């Protein structure tokens, strides 16, 4: 009875959601046609959090699908798990954003947001007690960054007493997939700072590095790349669906994770990451699990925490384990690494446990971290922005729409204030 | 602006080309120590896979084996040490009521 | 992971290589079209189309030695862009391989070497085939040595050169060419192996039953002595050596990098019915002057360093017994400053037999790599042959008209006299 | 809902379309009579109730000798009879005759047919205009076409596939006169103008292919392969789909600097392709040489500004960023200081198709880079010199003024191209 | 494994209301005995015969040493050392077959030892109550099946040392205003924490000032 509503805009958000619903449907024993075929009654017990019940035992997800072009939902619908989605919840535009923040925010976004708000108002008022909203988009894209932020702004004005959480894909440090990526990311995260409550930043290069060294996978694809995002995706709302020794919903994490409202930029992680050829030889226990957690190369963002200090750290455990060893090892990992945590907060680690491990793993867990080392991730974006903006590189696709230069300046100013606020607490 | 239909001539919908093989041609000899898929992280094995149970089906937990292993507390049950309501205590109970 | 790049420059190199690659494809299961109906990528590159293209760059400046490769049975097995062909023959002039016509084709050879080495990940040397007598093998090889040693550097390049014999010869300007190609290669090479054709003629006459030999038999023997060098990569043995292992066991000084190469059981098919080819007789069968592949007796010199690679069913127990008795005899000369002398390598792969070839199916075989002080007489005779002709600058008028001046011969003289004095300085002892 | 309307004007345009629409019917299940024996054809082909498929193109030329070949070719049952518009008088290498006298007479028919094709369309987003800068029709009539279309359909992105004149080899004599005017009247109405040179495909077919002595039909197949690589994402799935709108907001920084190039990397014979390993780290590495491009100008004269990569077949993304990360570490490949991002990738999920009896190999990988370089400023400088050496003595002025021209527009397009060269130098500081 | 201990403590507390005994202690004498002052009512809890099903039957468990290992600082449920403070008032509840005599014997031993110290204004100190019923055990339980049980409640001044770190934590947190906006959103003032800290400091002052003597 703490329902959640899933939003996805852009091809990145759609293809991340297409694997998240894979993971959730596998967890709850749901068929591709939309029928339940699991074994236990626990997987049906809080099925209302992610699914909406219909007659005859048919279960429909509470997802809203949108972009500006009909390119990716044709593959999303025609996939293996495309029949579960409601045909009414497919809304779409005509002209692609063309990797433009202006096209997704003022011209086409303004005339498409009304139907997306229609779908969200249809779905949100049917739930018994809405917990919050969940969105997946890409910071470097056109129809994701320009229009998901419009959706955040148009939703936050109507429910001011809920929790907003976004699922972003940060521009990579080395290789760019779009030349207007700083232009399309600075404005998007400028709008993201004042509106959301808890955000999760994902870098593609860190995922490639963790899939090449730890996973020993020389050739992963994008579909296998989205599986780790789905892993850290379903691991944060596991206590809302299953009982545990110590439950923690999304609001409890939001309270324990955000000390000040403008510092809510978190780095997701996943604990039991092994190779295929080294599965027989792992011996999963809590020590090697928490030693694999706080390794700097287990992180899904491009920020190495050694240049910064952790502010607050979350650790949601799942499965059969005892309890002194969890407290003992969050004592230990905080004690010997006191240079990497803050000295003005006595306890930095929030722990939570559940009782039902995932389908086929003995135990599993998810890492969420608020570190002051994320200031370097915004620093390179600010440098690229102030290098492109100084010579007016690609601006005429924005002032050629009806924007202003001063909005670019205030977005860069907000970025500098955010970097200074993260640096000041060090 | 929104369509009713995403298919040709404003009728029905678009069925795209689906890639049969989304994986990668091993141009050289494919390695044995190569972790090609990534759905193996949590795969339930066929037929046999552990369901989700509760505390009474656990071990060393709350409510576990309470009616089964009741012979251990039987010697503390069959002693005549519990207070039996005699005439005067029952009289006080009736006196309040 | 264990790759090696072959460059077959000049006529002698590719006329070795056309039998060498038959040997290589016969030791594996590769058909001559390129299909197989690990342990092959040291010499080949498997492609997604199932073809097995080798890693070789066939280069000659005249076409009449590579077109029969391009129309032969190996036309489907090679890569038809790496078979680099010039237009005019270098024609036994060092000027026409290093200065005039070699410089407009060397860019393509360097580009193909770079493209071949970019695909690899575990390079550990080069296999450069040339000769010290001609114009292409002494002019164009020395041109690309200076490039390969400045664009790769620390890699250990291995070369095979056919040295001019004392008595028999074909060219008459090769005393000029050998000193000219020695002057430039000496500072950009690591370990090159000398072979003389006269010694192979004596070997193929004496303990090999076949008289009237062609060049195919000599090329087969050279291919067998090369295949034993790289037998420790595609086959795993008891004592494995790599290609850069040879670089640090045979070069006492940066100037002295010319060892020889002998194959021990070069015996016939009819005579192999009669001999017990144990490792004890094999180990000292290569030590005789009748089996050395350079016409120089060891007794006037001293064996400065030695390296042996064994093959087939060879147990390492009797190898120690066989190698101990060698340094007990007084005639195998050894001096004070190198007490150890020897190195051993074993493998479990028997030496193969090419059908139609002459070498018999033997099951134990060693090759000896050794640098001796008994090679300074060859340098002395080449020096004498140069200074008898430069008494009145005989053949110089062809060279000076094609790129360089007269002074390039005096620098080569000052190099080779320094090499001679270095050898006789090494030979004497310090009391 | 991602359709394209292809405009083929000029001898070069129609001869290129003869190969492009030969490839298009092969990639789908389209027979040459227009029959398909599950709706990816819709970006180029329509649907009529008997099962007949009719393409969306306008083959228009001013002399009939070329379109009459298509009328009696092997594709005579496929095209619409009306959409093959033809004239009666050739413009005869004259911008004046194709832009003021003959072109204005027939320009209403092609606009009417384009309007009908757009009325059949629902989600049109692009125009594919095929011509050459050389002759009269492809330089004057195409210019009038984009002049009329840019004022009529508004902000629709029209992409232009024009054939640049080589500075050393050229067919006609009046070539600078017919290129300067169309560049002047195109520069404010185009979005992206991909430029291809004739000599630089000749040397590629001599070098990469073992072809000696080729014709135009070998060049048109490579042009068709590149143009199919451009619109590959509208037809097939993939990791990153790139439509025509982000070919337009990504490749051109300034409203005047919109002259990008094209380059197809895995161009090789079907016999050399056996013995060479077609790895993604190799073909991307074998895409930045000066000897593998379709413009003669060496990129070492200037700096790259924005590059876009399109990948077809099983190309997995990490070797893509490994390749273009090794590209960024090369001192030879120089970028500008004001574009730290530089690249853009797009991945598709089908192998490049080969026409039977063709030249290109059967390969599973394909790269098509649409680079935008400063080094094209020299290509304008040499043609500027050719303009100034001819106009100084009025070499062919009377052929133009006698067909509704003046003298002043010759002495304003010179200043327009001087301004364009000044802008090209400005972005390299 | 802790909730069963808390359940055993609470079952020993209300044991007199359930079964007869020699000295039953109702729920009112706990207040009159363990609470001297209206504000000073924060005692400890100690269950001494906590032992496994294997370390129980190797030993005799008399009342002399289950009343002795209980006073050691490694057996109470709050991390505080009783040697720093002074005991105020103590309650012992004996379950099971306990003759009343050796209770007073062990009491006489405990009042003899100088290693623990009391406050001067409590000359009696100890209130005891002997329930006559032994404790019960749980299937799958950690605790052994034993005859004798004791539960101590001890009013000590050493529990103020447990309060001497949480106030320090608040001084560390409140100085940088961390995590305050979650509280002041729903009808809360920034100054409520100030009066809460002043109330806690007043409690610390009370515990400091009770243990002094006026002579
Ligand atoms: N073992 C062996 N030696 C050969 C063969 N062909 C030539 N030679 C030797 O090579 C020597 C001459 O040097 P070459 O390598 O032929 O000269 P080159 O490098 O081809 O120079 P050009 O003839 O000008 O191209 C002769 O003395 C021969 O002994 C061969 O097929 N096998
Ligand atoms: N690459 C390539 N270029 C072509 C082809 N056909 C014609 N050309 C080019 O066309 C130019 C000749 O001028 P055109 O543009 O064809 O003349 P036009 O405007 O079409 O006028 P007409 O030829 O009379 O129809 C030459 O520079 C050729 O390079 C072709 O099939 N392939
Ligand atoms: N991990 C992952 N990243 C993706 C996927 N699809 C797109 N992206 C990322 O999204 C970025 C492109 O922005 P995008 O949202 O697709 O542009 P838009 O759709 O026009 O808004 C690229 O940097 C990609 O790395 C996917 O399936 N998986
Ligand atoms: Mg020759
Ligand atoms: Mg024409």
- Two structure tokens written together for A398: 């924005």
Taking Cα atoms as reference points, which of D198, D216, D207, D218 lies closest to residue D355?
A: D218
Q: Do the Cβ atoms of B42 and A93 come within 8 Å?
A: no
Q: Are residues A55 and A151 in the same domain?
A: yes
Taking Cα atoms as reference points, which of D85, D161, D84, D162 lies closest to residue D128?
A: D161
Residue A190 CA: distances (Å) to CA of A145, A405, A408, C39: 11, 15, 10, 57
Cα–Cα distance measured from residue A250 to residue A130, given in angstroms and rounded to the nearest whole number: 12
Domain C260-376 sits in CATH 3.30.1330.20: yes
Cα–Cα distance measured from residue D342 to residue D309, given in angstroms and rounded to the nearest whole number: 11
Cα–Cα distance measured from residue E51 to residue E63, given in angstroms and rounded to the nearest whole number: 15
Residue C360 CA: distances (Å) to CA of A264, C108, C218, D12: 80, 41, 15, 69
DSSP letter for each residue of A201-223 = EEEHHHHHHHHHTTS--S---HH
Q: Do the Cβ atoms of B27 and C47 come within 8 Å?
A: yes
Rg (CA), chain C: 21
Cβ–Cβ contact C302 with D under 8 A: no
Q: Where does CATH 3.40.50.1440 sit in chain D?
A: 3-251
Residue C389 CA: distances (Å) to CA of C95, C174, C385, C396: 18, 11, 7, 10
8 A C-beta contact, residue C54 and residue C76:
no
Strand pairing partners for E193? none
* φ, ψ at A409 (rounded to 5°): -65, -40
Q: Chain B interface residues facing chain D, Cβ-Cβ under 8 Å? A: 3, 6-10, 14-19, 21-25, 27
8 A C-beta contact, residue A88 and residue A130:
no
For residue A352, the tally of other CB atoms under 10 A from its CB is 24
Considering A352, A374, A396, which residue would you say is the last residue of a domain? A374
Cα–Cα distance measured from residue A153 to residue A158, given in angstroms and rounded to the nearest whole number: 9
Catalytic residues of C: 245
Q: What's the CATH fold of domain D3-251? A: Rossmann fold (3.40.50)
Task: Indicate if ligand 3 lies below 6 Å from the C-beta of A146.
Answer: no
Catalytic residues of E: 29
Cα–Cα distance measured from residue D268 to residue D283, given in angstroms and rounded to the nearest whole number: 11
Q: Are residues A37 and A155 in the same domain?
A: yes
Q: Where does CATH 3.30.1330.20 sit in chain D?
A: 261-377
- Two structure tokens written together for C385: 């042959």
Taking Cα atoms as reference points, which of C28, C140, C132 lies closest to residue C89?
A: C140
Strand pairing partners for D128? D6, D159
- Assign residue A326 the CATH number of its domain: 3.30.1330.20
Taking Cα atoms as reference points, which of A317, A309, A326 lies closest to residue A270?
A: A317
CA atoms lying within 13 Å on the CB side of residue D188:
11
Which experimental approach was used here?
Answer: cryo-EM
Cα–Cα distance measured from residue A376 to residue A384, given in angstroms and rounded to the nearest whole number: 12
SS3 of residue C280 by DSSP: helix
Cα–Cα distance measured from residue C330 to residue C79, given in angstroms and rounded to the nearest whole number: 53
SS3 of residue B73 by DSSP: coil
By CB atoms closer than 10 A (0-12, 13-18, 19+), residue E213 is exposed
Cα–Cα distance measured from residue C296 to residue C275, given in angstroms and rounded to the nearest whole number: 27
CA D103 / ligand 5 centre spacing (Å): 12
Q: Are residues A364 and A388 in the same domain?
A: no
Q: Are residues A27 and A57 in the same domain?
A: yes
Strand pairing partners for A136? A8, A167
DSSP letter for each residue of D294-345 = SSSS-GGGS-EEEEEEEEESS--HHHHHHHHHHHHT-SSS-B-TT-SS----
Can you give the residue range of the structural domain that contains A45? Answer: 3-257
8 A C-beta contact, residue A289 and residue A271:
yes
Query: Which CATH architecture describes the domain C3-250?
Result: 3-Layer(aba) Sandwich (3.40)
- Two structure tokens written together for A311: 């502010």
- Assign residue A95 the CATH number of its domain: 3.40.50.1440
Residue D257 CA: distances (Å) to CA of D190, D248, D420, D422: 11, 12, 8, 11
Q: Where are the alpha helices (DSSP H) in C250-359?
A: 279-285, 316-324
* φ, ψ at A349 (rounded to 5°): -110, 125
Considering A374, A389, A412, which residue would you say is the last residue of a domain? A374
Which residue puts its alpha carbon closest to atom 17 of ligand 3?
Answer: A141
Q: Are residues A351 and A394 in the same domain?
A: no
Residues within 5 Å of ion ligand 5 by Cβ? D 10-11, 61, 137
- Considering only the top CATH level, what class is D261-377? alpha beta
Nearest CB neighbour to A255, from listed E169, E176, E182: E182
Cβ–Cβ contact D233 with B under 8 A: no
Check residue E189 and give left, alpha or beta (phi > 0: left; psi -120 to 50: alpha). beta
Q: Are residues A83 and A227 in the same domain?
A: yes
Q: Where does CATH 3.40.50.1440 sit in chain C?
A: 3-250
Cβ–Cβ contact D321 with B under 8 A: no
In CATH, which of 2.102.10.10, 3.40.50.280, 1.10.10.10, 3.30.1330.20 is domain E44-160?
3.30.1330.20
Which residue puts its alpha carbon closest to atom 17 of ligand 1?
Answer: C134
DSSP letter for each residue of A381-405 = HHHHHHHHHHTT-SGGGTTTTT--H
3-state helix, strand, coil in chain E (%, to 5): 30, 15, 55
8 A C-beta contact, residue D335 and residue D306:
no
Residue A1 CA: distances (Å) to CA of A159, A352, C431, D304, E67: 18, 20, 98, 56, 51
Q: Residues near D177 by Cβ (< 8 Å), separated by ≥ 6?
A: D95, D387, D390, D396, D400
CA atoms lying within 13 Å on the CB side of residue C220:
18
- Two structure tokens written together for A322: 């005892």
Three-state DSSP string of D347-403: ECCCCCCCCCCCCCCCCCCEEEEEEEECCHHHHHHHHHHHHHHHHCCCCCHHHHHCC
SS3 of residue C349 by DSSP: coil
Longest dimension (CA), chain D: 63
Q: Do the Cβ atoms of C80 and D271 come within 8 Å?
A: yes
Cα–Cα distance measured from residue C26 to residue C100, given in angstroms and rounded to the nearest whole number: 40
Chain B residues touching C47 at Cβ < 8 A = 27
Pocket test for ligand 1, best of C64, C133, C166 (most atoms within 8 A of CB): C133
- Two structure tokens written together for C80: 């038809």
Taking Cα atoms as reference points, which of D323, D349, D390, D410 lies closest to residue D170?
A: D390
Alpha carbon dihedral C312, C314, C319, C322, in 10-degree steps, equals: -80
Q: Residues near A185 by Cβ (< 8 Å), separated by ≥ 6?
A: A139, A140, A145, A170, A171, A381
Strand pairing partners for D311? D347, D367
Pocket test for ligand 3, best of A11, A66, A136, A397 (most atoms within 8 A of CB): A11
Residue linked to tokens 């020389």: A218
Q: Number of folded domains in chain A?
A: 3
Nearest CB neighbour to A387, from listed D255, D325, D340: D340
Strands C260-263 and C364-372: antiparallel
Cβ–Cβ contact C352 with D under 8 A: no
């Amino acid at each position: 009875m703490r329902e959640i509503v899933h939003l996805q805009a852009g091809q990145c958000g759609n293809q991340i959601g297409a694997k998240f619903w894979e993971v959730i449907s596998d967890e709850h024993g749901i068929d591709p046609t939309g029928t339940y075929h699991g074994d236990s009654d626990l997987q049906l017990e809080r099925i209302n959090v992610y699914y909406n019940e219909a007659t005859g035992g048919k279960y429909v997800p509470r997802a809203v699908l949108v972009d500006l072009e009909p390119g990716t939902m044709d593959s999303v619908r025609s996939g293996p798990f495309g029949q579960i989605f409601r045909p009414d919840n497919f809304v779409f535009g005509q002209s692609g954003a063309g990797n433009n923040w202006a096209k997704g925010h003022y011209t086409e976004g303004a005339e498409l947001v009304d139907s997306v708000l229609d779908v969200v108002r249809k779905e949100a008022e049917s739930c018994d007690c809405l917990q919050g909203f969940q969105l997946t988009h890409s910071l470097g894209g056109g129809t994701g960054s320009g229009m998901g932020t419009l959706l955040i702004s148009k939703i936050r004005e109507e429910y001011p007493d809920r929790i907003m959480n976004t699922f972003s894909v940060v521009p990579s440090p080395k290789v760019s997939d779009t030349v207007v990526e700083p232009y399309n990311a600075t404005l998007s995260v400028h709008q993201l700072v004042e509106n959301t409550d808890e955000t999760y930043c994902i870098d593609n290069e860190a995922l490639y590095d963790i899939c090449f060294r730890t996973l020993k996978l020389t050739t992963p694809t994008y579909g296998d790349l989205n599986h780790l995002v789905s892993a850290t995706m379903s691991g944060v709302t596991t206590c809302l669906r299953f009982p545990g020794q110590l439950n923690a919903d999304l609001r409890k994490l939001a309270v324990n994770m955000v000390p000040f409202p403008r510092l809510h930029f978190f780095m997701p992680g996943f604990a039991p990451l092994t190779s295929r050829g080294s599965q027989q030889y792992r011996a999963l226990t809590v020590p090697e699990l928490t030693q694999q957690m706080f390794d700097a190369k287990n992180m899904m963002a491009a920020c190495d925490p050694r240049h910064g200090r952790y502010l607050t750290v979350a650790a949601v455990f799942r499965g059969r384990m005892s309890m002194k060893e969890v407290d003992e090892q969050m004592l230990n990992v905080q004690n010997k690494n006191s240079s990497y945590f803050v000295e003005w907060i006595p306890n930095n680690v929030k722990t939570a446990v559940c009782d039902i491990p995932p389908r086929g793993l003995k135990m599993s867990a998810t890492f969420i971290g608020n570190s002051t080392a994320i200031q370097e991730l915004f620093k390179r974006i600010s440098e690229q922005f102030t290098a492109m903006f100084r010579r007016k590189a690609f601006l005429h696709w924005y002032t050629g729409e009806g924007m202003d230069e001063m909005e670019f300046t205030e977005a860069e100013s907000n970025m500098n204030d955010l970097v200074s606020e993260y640096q000041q607490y060090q | 602006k929104r369509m009713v239909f995403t298919g040709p001539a404003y009728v029905k919908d678009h069925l795209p080309q689906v890639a049969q093989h989304t994986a990668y041609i091993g141009e050289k000899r494919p390695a044995l120590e190569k972790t090609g898929d990534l759905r193996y992280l949590w795969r339930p094995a066929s037929n046999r896979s552990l369901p989700a149970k509760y505390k009474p089906e656990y071990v060393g937990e709350i409510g576990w084996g309470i009616p089964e292993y009741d012979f251990i507390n039987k010697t503390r049950l069959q002693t005549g040490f519990h207070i039996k309501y005699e005439e005067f205590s029952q009289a006080a109970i009736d006196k309040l009521s | 992971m264990r790759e090696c790049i072959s460059i077959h420059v000049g006529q002698a190199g590719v006329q070795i290589g056309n039998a060498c690659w038959e040997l290589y494809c016969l030791e594996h299961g590769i058909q001559p079209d390129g299909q197989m109906p690990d342990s092959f990528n040291t010499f080949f590159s498997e492609t997604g189309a199932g073809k097995h293209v080798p890693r070789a760059v066939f280069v000659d400046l005249e076409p009449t030695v590579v077109d029969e490769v391009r129309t032969g049975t190996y036309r489907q097995l090679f890569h038809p862009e790496q078979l680099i062909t010039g237009k005019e023959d270098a024609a036994n002039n060092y000027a026409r391989g290093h200065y005039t016509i070699g410089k407009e084709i060397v860019d393509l050879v360097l580009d193909r070497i770079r493209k071949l080495a970019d695909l690899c990940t575990g390079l550990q040397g080069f296999l450069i085939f040339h000769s010290f007598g001609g114009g292409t093998g002494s002019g164009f090889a020395s041109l690309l040595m200076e490039r390969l040693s400045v664009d790769y550097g620390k890699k250990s390049k291995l070369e095979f050169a056919i040295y001019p014999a004392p008595q028999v010869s074909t060219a008459v300007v090769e005393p000029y060419n050998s000193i000219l190609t020695t002057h430039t290669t000496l500072e950009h090479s690591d370990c090159a192996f000398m072979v003389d054709n006269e010694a192979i003629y004596d070997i193929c006459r004496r303990n090999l039953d076949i008289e009237r030999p062609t060049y195919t038999n000599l090329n087969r023997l050279i291919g067998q002595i090369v295949s034993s060098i790289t037998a420790s990569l595609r086959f795993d043995g008891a004592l494995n050596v790599d290609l850069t292992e040879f670089q640090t066991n045979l070069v006492p000084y940066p100037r002295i990098h010319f060892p020889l190469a002998t194959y021990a059981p070069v015996i016939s098919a009819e005579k192999a019915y009669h001999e017990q080819l144990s490792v004890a007789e094999i180990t000292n069968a290569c030590f005789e002057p009748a089996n050395q592949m350079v016409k120089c007796d060891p007794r006037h010199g001293k064996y400065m360093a030695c390296c042996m690679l064994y093959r087939g069913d060879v147990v390492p127990k009797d190898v120690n017994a066989a190698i101990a008795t060698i340094k007990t005899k007084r005639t195998i000369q050894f001096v004070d400053w190198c007490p150890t002398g020897f190195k051993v390598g074993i493998n479990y792969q028997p030496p193969t037999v090419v059908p139609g070839g002459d070498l018999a199916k033997v099951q134990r075989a060693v090759c000896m790599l050794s640098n001796t002080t008994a090679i300074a007489e060859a340098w002395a005779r080449l020096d004498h042959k140069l200074d008898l002709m430069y008494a009145k600058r005989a053949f110089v008028h062809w060279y000076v008209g094609e790129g360089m001046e007269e002074g390039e011969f005096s620098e080569a003289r000052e190099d080779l006299a320094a090499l001679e004095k270095d050898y006789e300085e090494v030979g004497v002892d310090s009391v």
